Amino acid sequence: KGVLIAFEGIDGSGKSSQATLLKDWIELKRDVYLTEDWIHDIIKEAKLLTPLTFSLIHATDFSDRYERYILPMLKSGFIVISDRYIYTAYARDSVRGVDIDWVKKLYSFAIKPDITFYIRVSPDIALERIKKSKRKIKPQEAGADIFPGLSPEEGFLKYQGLITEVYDKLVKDENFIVIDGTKTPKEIQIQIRKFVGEL
Amino acid sequence: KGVLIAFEGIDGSGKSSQATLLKDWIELKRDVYLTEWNSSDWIHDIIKEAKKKDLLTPLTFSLIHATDFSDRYERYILPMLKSGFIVISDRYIYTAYARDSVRGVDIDWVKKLYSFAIKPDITFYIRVSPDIALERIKKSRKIKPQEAGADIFPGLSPEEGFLKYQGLITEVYDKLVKDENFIVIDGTKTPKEIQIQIRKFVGELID
Ligand code: NI
Numbered sequence: 215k216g217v218l219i220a221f222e223g224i225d226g227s228g229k230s231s232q233a234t235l236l237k238d239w240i241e242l243k244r245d246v247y248l249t250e251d252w253i254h255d256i257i258k259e260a261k262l263l264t265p266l267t268f269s270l271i272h273a274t275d276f277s278d279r280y281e282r283y284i285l286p287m288l289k290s291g292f293i294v295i296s297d298r299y300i301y302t303a304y305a306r307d308s309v310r311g312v313d314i315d316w317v318k319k320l321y322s323f324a325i326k327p328d329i330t331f332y333i334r335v336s337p338d339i340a341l342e343r344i345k346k347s348k349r350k351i352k353p354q355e356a357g358a359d360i361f362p363g364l365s366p367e368e369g370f371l372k373y374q375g376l377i378t379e380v381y382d383k384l385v386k387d388e389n390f391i392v393i394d395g396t397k398t399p400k401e402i403q404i405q406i407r408k409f410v411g412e413l
Numbered sequence: 414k415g416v417l418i419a420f421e422g423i424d425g426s427g428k429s430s431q432a433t434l435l436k437d438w439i440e441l442k443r444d445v446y447l448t449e450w451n452s453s454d455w456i457h458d459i460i461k462e463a464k465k466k467d468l469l470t471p472l473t474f475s476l477i478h479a480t481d482f483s484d485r486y487e488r489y490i491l492p493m494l495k496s497g498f499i500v501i502s503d504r505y506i507y508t509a510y511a512r513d514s515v516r517g518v519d520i521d522w523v524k525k526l527y528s529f530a531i532k533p534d535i536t537f538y539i540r541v542s543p544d545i546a547l548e549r550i551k552k553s554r555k556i557k558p559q560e561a562g563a564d565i566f567p568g569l570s571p572e573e574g575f576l577k578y579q580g581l582i583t584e585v586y587d588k589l590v591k592d593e594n595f596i597v598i599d600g601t602k603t604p605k606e607i608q609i610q611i612r613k614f615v616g617e618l619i620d
Binding site: 252255256259264266267270273278316319320 | 455476479480483522529
């Protein structure tokens with residue numbers, strides 16, 4: 215009865231918007247919940263911390279939300295949508311040198327999603343879209359902790375390029391439902407609503 | 414070369430005394446750094462205070478401590494070992510193994526969780542029954558809620574919780590002996606005799 219739906223994609227993929235668009239629409243049919251913080255003070259108090267410790271910090275926060283929101287609502291048959299799930303950690307942590315199989319074991323208390331949508335779009339195209347909207351490129355998005363002194367536009371191409379690599383390597387094993395993010399937001403959402411329409 | 418010596422044991426087992434006494438001896442011949450597992454640092458404190466309102470699950474409790482330990486390890490413990498120090502740990506990862514697993518977190522997952530830390534060259538388990546440790550505790554001092562497993566057994570007298578809670582910790586340590594190669598020291602012996610035995614095992618190694 216409980217169903218877990220996850221979205222993954224690089225920054226700029228529109229995956230958060232797709233996740234919220236799907237919530238609003240599923241709410242018409244049945245019980246759904248969207249994953250919605252001290253991490254603030256920790257990062258702010260650093261100033262370094264190793265990537266290992268960073269991986270633990272994010273896993274601690276993930277465990278908290280998982281056992282206090284995600285898992286209980288699944289037990290009450292909510293659909294739960296999460297627009298980042300453990301695969302985001304797999305990528306975030308392993309591009310910074312942490313043994314991905316170690317990260318997988320770390321997160322092995324979490325269940326596999328019934329569906330995972332990989333909204334796949336290249337970094338080139340993600341950037342030109344961020345630029346057409348005139349938004350500012352967050353340092354986290356540029357991977358500036360790994361590439362200081364690249365511009366923000368080129369960090370984004372490099373870091374999100376490394377992140378894409380990891381997502382592509384997980385596609386087979388993790389049964390990602392690969393979606394073409396070059397399509398428009400409407401075309402993407404309608405295809406997502408159609409896929410979810412099935413299970 | 415750097416060497417890592419861990420002390421394990423239940424509350425009231427004397428292990429901290431034994432750690433400190435070892436430190437005072439070894440610091441006469443060479444460089445030595447004593448750290449205590451229970452002395453959590455900045456990251457732990459920020460998380461616990463920030464979540465003071467919420468009830469944390471055991472898994473989360475366990476990650477908070479591993480996270481904080483990962484920082485202390487890369488910042489203090491590994492550099493002291495690389496710099497040639499002898500490192501003495503009064504409580505080490507095995508304490509988390511026991512703590513987190515009597516609260517329901519799967520011990521095999523905790524082992525994986527801490528897989529990043531190196532095994533001690535020597536681990537001393539100063540074995541003392543919970544009754545005997547209770548008796549020393551009385552004959553001195555009140556028992557802290559954490560020593561009594563207060564969260565797990567809020568319906569018990571401090572004394573009785575210490576016996577049930579420390580009993581469980583003892584089971585976990587006993588089941589690690591073989592795998593973790595603990596050197597099991599009979600903690601009913603006098604403190605002077607315990608230290609003499611520890612000093613001889615350490616002597617054998619580092620000489
Ligand atoms: Ni603590």
